[PDB]
Amino acid sequence: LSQFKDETNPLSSLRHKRRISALGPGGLTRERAGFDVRDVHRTHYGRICPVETPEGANIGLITSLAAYARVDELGFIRTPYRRVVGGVVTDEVVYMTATEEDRYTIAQANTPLEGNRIAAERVVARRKGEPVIVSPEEVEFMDVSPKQVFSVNTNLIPFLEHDDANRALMGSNMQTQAVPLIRAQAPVVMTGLEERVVRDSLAALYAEEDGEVAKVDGNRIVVRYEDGRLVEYPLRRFYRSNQGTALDQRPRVVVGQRVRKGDLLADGPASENGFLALGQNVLVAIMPFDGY
Amino acid sequence: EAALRDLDEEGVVRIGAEVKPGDILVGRTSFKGESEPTPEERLLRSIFGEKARDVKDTSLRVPPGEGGIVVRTVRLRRGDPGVELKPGVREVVRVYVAQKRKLQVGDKLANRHGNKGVVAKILPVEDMPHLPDGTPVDVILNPLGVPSRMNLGQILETHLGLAGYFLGQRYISPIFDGAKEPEIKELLAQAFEVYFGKRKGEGFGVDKREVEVLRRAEKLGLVTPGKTPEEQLKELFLQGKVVLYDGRTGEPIEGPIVVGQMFIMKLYHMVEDKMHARSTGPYSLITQQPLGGKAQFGGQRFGEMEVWALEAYGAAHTLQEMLTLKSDDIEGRNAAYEAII
Amino acid sequence: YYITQVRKEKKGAGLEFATPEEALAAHERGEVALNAPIKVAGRETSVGRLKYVFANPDEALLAVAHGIVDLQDVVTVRYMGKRLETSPGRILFARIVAEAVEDEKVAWELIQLDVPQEKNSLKDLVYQAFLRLGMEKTARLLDALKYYGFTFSTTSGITIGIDDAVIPEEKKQYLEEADRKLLQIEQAYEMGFLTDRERYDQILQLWTETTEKVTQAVFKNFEENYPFNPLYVMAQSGARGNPQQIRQLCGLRGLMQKPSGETFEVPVRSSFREGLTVLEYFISSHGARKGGADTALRTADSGYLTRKLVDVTHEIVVREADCGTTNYISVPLFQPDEVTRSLRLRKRADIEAGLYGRVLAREVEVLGVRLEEGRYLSMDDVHLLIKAAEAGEIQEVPVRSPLTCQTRYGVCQKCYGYDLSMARPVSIGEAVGIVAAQSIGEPGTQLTMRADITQGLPRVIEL
Amino acid sequence: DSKLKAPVFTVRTQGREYGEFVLEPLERGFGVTLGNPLRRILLSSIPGTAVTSVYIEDVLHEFSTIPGVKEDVVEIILNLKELVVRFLNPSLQTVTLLLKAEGPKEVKARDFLPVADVEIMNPDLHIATLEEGGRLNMEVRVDRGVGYVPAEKHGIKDRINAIPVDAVFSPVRRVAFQVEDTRLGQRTDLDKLTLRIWTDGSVTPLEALNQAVEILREHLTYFSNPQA
Amino acid sequence: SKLKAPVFTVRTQGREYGEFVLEPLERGFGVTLGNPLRRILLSSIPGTAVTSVYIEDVLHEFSTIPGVKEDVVEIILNLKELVVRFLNPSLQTVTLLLKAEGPKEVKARDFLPVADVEIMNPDLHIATLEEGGRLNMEVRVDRGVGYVPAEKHGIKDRINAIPVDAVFSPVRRVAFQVEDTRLGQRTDLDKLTLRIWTDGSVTPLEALNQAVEILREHLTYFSNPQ
Amino acid sequence: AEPGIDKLFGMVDSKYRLTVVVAKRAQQLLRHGFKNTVLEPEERPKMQTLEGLFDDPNAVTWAMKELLTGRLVFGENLVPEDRLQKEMERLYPV
Ligand SMILES: [Mg+2]
Ligand SMILES: [Mg+2]
Ligand SMILES: [Mg+2]
Ligand SMILES: [Zn+2]
């Protein structure tokens, strides 16, 4: 379970820390594992991503945690839900385990609402994992968002609902293998998680509080905070990762610029103004060309 | 002196020097030890009057297929604070070499929807298909990869990319709750008014080649008959298709082509890290067979299923060569090399 | 395929005239299209057949360069002394084969002019050229086909757009019909007319029939309205795709299975063009994981089977010309039909797999043709035997087989028969044992790497 | 008659970077016959100038940073590839530009020292940002040539610590041509050709068109001597 | 380091076929030269063709004549393969006369001779007659370029005349090929091969020379602005 | 495809016999420096070099072209093995 760190790009290291393995001491064996342990259970909904897995001898044995899921003190994965009382959806959010979830009727997040009240007369819901059609008065809980069903890598694929599951497995896995580029740019069409991935990877540099930038350089940045202390941030330049890719930080501010709390100071690898940038945007024609 | 040009006085390569395969990174001598010079080498050294030395070359050189620019050198010595060297080790030297890699034939590209492939052809700008305004495309993708894989997300991404190319804007569409075709088609209507409205102001009408393509478009049921050429061109635009010219001939493609903007990533697997070859090299201790692996300069494995293929062909002499002359027949492999030279 | 397919117009499509000049007058008035099927006096023709008459292929292709006609338009051409009614594209295809083989008379007999060139027709062309010309001329023909196929696919204009996945109008009506019948079933169950299992089985049957209706509606819509649709053309020509995958793109996804093997009562009613819901996507993921696990956990069994076959047949070699035996086997041409309790003729492919390239043990007299003993059976001979069986003249064929061969440590040339990779008698010294093991093992491993997990490979391993 | 009269040539220009050229009337099919070869020649075979090597004081290679400078050497070289230099002397083949700046300032292409028969077409191009206490002393070499030559091919180094730079010599930026449906008398199938050329300003569109026509003319003389 | 001037070789066999090779060339110049020449060769080379035919007792093109195997359609098709060369540059249009009695096999040599008119293929088969068969035919030959359908020109010299498609172009077919070649350390060079088919009125080498001159003349139009 | 491969396969009863005949003939040509060839001076295979057109060094190519002419005799138990080599050396010193 102690593994050489994967840091081809900032997203590669974020995924490696969220992986769940059934192997190791006290676990299963790759050769003696049956079909039951490698299958998608109905209780994986909102807790384990159903698509992100390696095809081959490790299929169904190494998985990923869902985006909104969290592990409790006893070690059980929980997912959030919205309380529904009297046909109106509230802002109270409850985290619950799989055994507690089986006692309620939980509606889908795409249920039409007029403000906070359910408008549709027929509601699609789940009862112990099975899809049913119920009236609004029988609904007790609601999904927070469609994003809680999938992991971070799968949440970065736009128009996912139009893609086959087998091909979507390749799309999310291959984003780990993208290399940083000297002119990397953010995609034209995004899903909305690009900013948070960069922020939570600790690869870029942000302002601790409001202040003014005093010194800007390719090696250091000095910021004068409002309370008066001087903080100097050394920048990592031309550093070699475990995979051999070069990791560098480029400053994004000028001398005298005023910055608020949380403002970007320097871009990390594979980032563009705080947005994840794993490639280029190019003009594409879909047509055969002379057998090439 | 040519081989020692880039080394400093301490025997290490200077920072900023360009290194190629066979170049020396750091020089090192070893004591040769005791041995009986062959009788032939005895006469050879006596004729030239050259007294032998007690040391030999054991320096570190660039492996084949590598090289670049020296950027850093690290030196650790015994007794330094925090340096815990193994017993018997005096010092250790580390050298860092950096290279800038451009795209080439054999590199792997992919998008977020699972479409992947290698680069097989790089074309000059005048050979690529271009828009009527003269703008060439960058990447050409085969439509045969879509129907069997059932990944239609790349098609919708291309359509939204085309509208944003002319409107100069980006979009955020959350999964399962985002942009739909009625919303995409209304953005394409605004993009057409700047893609085609600009042409009218400059004083240009409809191309002769565009008229020919529109004539076939209604035969395929793509446009409504009886409309003006401008209206029919707008109908094709709302489907994500434009008239495309061939750079080699100047004639249009006989059918409208889907053109748009897509996000493509460059993958870690590169051909420059995978190509390897070997004629002769290191051998194993017990079996006396060639080692394996590019890092060890090893040979390729001829397994059981490969032997079955030669047997089915009836190539008896080809099979016997790989079993003996090229793997572990020591007398045969020494004689084979001397015969060829 | 693109240049060999002809256009079909529907503007006129039925108008009748009296003289060809009358039909041509209406064409210039915009009433009838060039390829619209019309009747002049008694015969059905088109304007293009009468308006454009070409003396030779050079004139027809020259007019295409000047833009008067397209490759897909049907016209009249004079070629090899015949006043054919074909498109310039099909005339162009005939010239490709003639120049590749450098013989106009033989190449004319090798091709099928009046059909578009699909995967099946191109495979027959290659096999016939091998029989008549040899390896050297067949290799040259293969390169010529590759060169022109790549050239024409670039300039034709094949592309994929979101609107190319055409939704049939009948899908909305079919789904509403299913809902009315579904509600009828539930009412009957509530009144005690049927049990739980009976209700569950009826629901599955209703959705199975509805899915097949949608598949027919998808392809019927393409044929009548969009014959040149990129998805339709790819499946019809055999380039890419099958009807099952086309339905998921344009119709509905269909029923899905639980991890336990049971099927969900509610199917996925949306296609990939419309987009799935979160609940539908999760339900469909159970079967995707199951297919991936079967691929990974069953490639070793297929590979293990191949190794067993090699170790049991590795010593079988063609060691002599003839063993001198008089034993043989009889290959049946008819099989019992247990469902109807009668004898019916076998499939043509099954008969070919047991008779092609085999030495006749005894003399056979069929349809006035004498097949002597010791004659290798070509593909034409097999076809003649099938025709004779359809006339009730023969029921079985005596042939020499390795089962009855008397050669020690192998087989003889006369008992083995043909070298299937060369369409000629097998040469002495070939390791036919290794070839047999590789031939059996290859399809099993390839299929499981892409049914075969059912009583397929497990059934074969048991046998 | 069947032999059409000589077409009239019309030129419309916008400064030194854009131009339009019209040739009408033409016989049917000659718009593509003439327009396409000119576009292919214009986009590939027009000589120009480019930066081929740069030397910066106290810098050993391009994978380093300069104290007091916001940008690193890689970003500086990218900015230098957008520099446009015009040679006023046809016999001139190579020139060297010198820059010496001290912070705090934002250096532009106009901070280069003047050289005779050399003109900078984009003086407002941004090169680097200097912080207080920063210095920038560098020498840039500009050559003349054709096509696209990678730095790995020429490998030009004026001294020990010079850094070779990939060269894009083409001054032409974009070429497009239009074919319209014109008529003359009773003939309605005639062609009208319009050529649109975009350049960087060192070479005007009219000059580039003349050079492309001459290149095509000299190639047609190669069909003269049969060597059977 | 500009490229050396290429070598132009010719392989001409007979009077109707020829191959021409030009190498070495800069990258992409094979397409640059090959495409314009093919377009000019197929549409701009001057030639002669039959534009109208008059046949006695024939009302329409789709009828048949008693006493001859070939119908009106087949006779018209045979006329479109006739090759005629005008010796006099001033001469523009001629009319040929044909009168035959059965059961002879009518050939192209049976036409009455005309001053400054030469028949290139006198062995061409026109029609086959039987006992009691008559064939009184008049054809009109014009000058032009390219290919013109009958419905376009609509030329009739008299009542009941049948216009026929005019195949003016002497060139039958053009096909060019571009191959990758090398010269020392340069590996991106081009080699161009040009193949031309002609009806025999003009040599394939003559057609190539005319096509080059036509393109050269058009390049001089970019001379006097406004 | 090899030139004349269809005709070469029709000269032998077994396809593996053709390979043996070609391989042994190629060894004979290399042993005697192509001085024992049955080809005419205008029939010798050639390769294009920068200096000029020279003889083909590939002996397998020579052997295949010699077999198509029909001036070679092949079979089993033709001549004693020792008598063959000694006679060839005396006729073609090398
Ligand atoms: Mg793997
Ligand atoms: Mg007609
Ligand atoms: Mg420039
Ligand atoms: Zn036998």
Side-chain angles (χ1 to χ4, degrees), chain F residues 5-22:
Chain F
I5 184 64
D6 297 317
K7 185 177 178 291
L8 287 177
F9 274 139
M11 292 169 67
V12 289
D13 56 354
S14 168
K15 75 191 264 191
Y16 307 108
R17 170 165 275 122
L18 166 74
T19 304
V20 168
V21 171
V22 165

Side-chain angles (χ1 to χ4, degrees), chain D residues 123-142:
Chain D
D124 302 300
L125 176 65
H126 180 271
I127 294 180
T129 299
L130 289 205
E131 191 210 348
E132 167 67 282
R135 289 184 180 175
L136 194 57
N137 192 342
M138 58 197 292
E139 309 170 352
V140 182
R141 158 166 178 167
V142 180

Side-chain angles (χ1 to χ4, degrees), chain B residues 150 152, chain C residues 162-168 171 214 217-219 221-222 229 231-232 243-253 269-274:
Chain B
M150 296 184 283
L152 282 188
Chain C
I162 197 56
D163 286 331
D164 293 326
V166 185
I167 310 295
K171 176 184 172 180
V214 173
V218 164
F219 274 82
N221 189 22
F222 276 154
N229 182 282
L231 295 177
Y232 187 61
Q244 283 78 55
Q245 295 164 347
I246 301 303
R247 174 202 89 236
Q248 314 194 37
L249 293 181
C250 302
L252 81 163
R253 199 84 194 283
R269 313 146 70 94
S270 77
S271 56
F272 279 124
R273 181 208 208 274
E274 310 170 19

Side-chain angles (χ1 to χ4, degrees), chain E residues 1 11 14 45 54 58 88 96 126 130 149 155 158 162 215-216 222 225:
Chain E
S1 169
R11 297 173 297 183
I45 309 303
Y54 174 76
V58 164
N88 174 29
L96 309 179
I126 297 302
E130 277 87 9
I155 280 163
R158 45 197 314 176
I162 311 174
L215 188 50
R216 188 204 67 74
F222 297 100

Side-chain angles (χ1 to χ4, degrees), chain F residues 4-90:
Chain F
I5 184 64
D6 297 317
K7 185 177 178 291
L8 287 177
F9 274 139
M11 292 169 67
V12 289
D13 56 354
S14 168
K15 75 191 264 191
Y16 307 108
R17 170 165 275 122
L18 166 74
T19 304
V20 168
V21 171
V22 165
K24 285 192 180 184
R25 182 50 180 181
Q27 289 164 17
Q28 292 179 8
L29 287 165
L30 284 178
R31 199 181 300 114
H32 297 257
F34 293 101
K35 304 274 189 169
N36 44 346
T37 187
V38 303
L39 290 182
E40 298 304 316
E42 70 269 13
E43 296 171 349
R44 298 161 83 85
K46 306 280 179 180
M47 74 170 294
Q48 183 58 67
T49 325
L50 293 175
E51 319 178 3
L53 194 70
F54 299 134
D55 269 341
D56 209 316
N58 200 222
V60 177
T61 300
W62 281 64
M64 282 199 220
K65 194 169 182 180
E66 286 183 336
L67 222 51
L68 280 176
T69 60
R71 302 167 193 136
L72 292 184
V73 177
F74 60 97
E76 289 199 339
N77 285 291
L78 290 187
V79 287
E81 43 278 359
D82 277 299
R83 182 72 186 118
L84 183 52
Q85 270 195 0
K86 66 154 305 181
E87 152 72 13
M88 272 190 99
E89 293 288 326
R90 184 196 59 68

Side-chain angles (χ1 to χ4, degrees), chain C residues 323 325 400 405-407 412 415:
Chain C
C323 61
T325 193
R400 291 166 70 103
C405 192
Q406 281 173 5
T407 299
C412 73
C415 285

Side-chain angles (χ1 to χ4, degrees), chain D residues 49-50 81-84 168-171 173 200:
Chain D
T49 59
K81 291 181 67 181
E82 305 297 325
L83 184 66
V84 180
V168 181
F169 292 106
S170 180
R173 270 182 186 152
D200 57 0

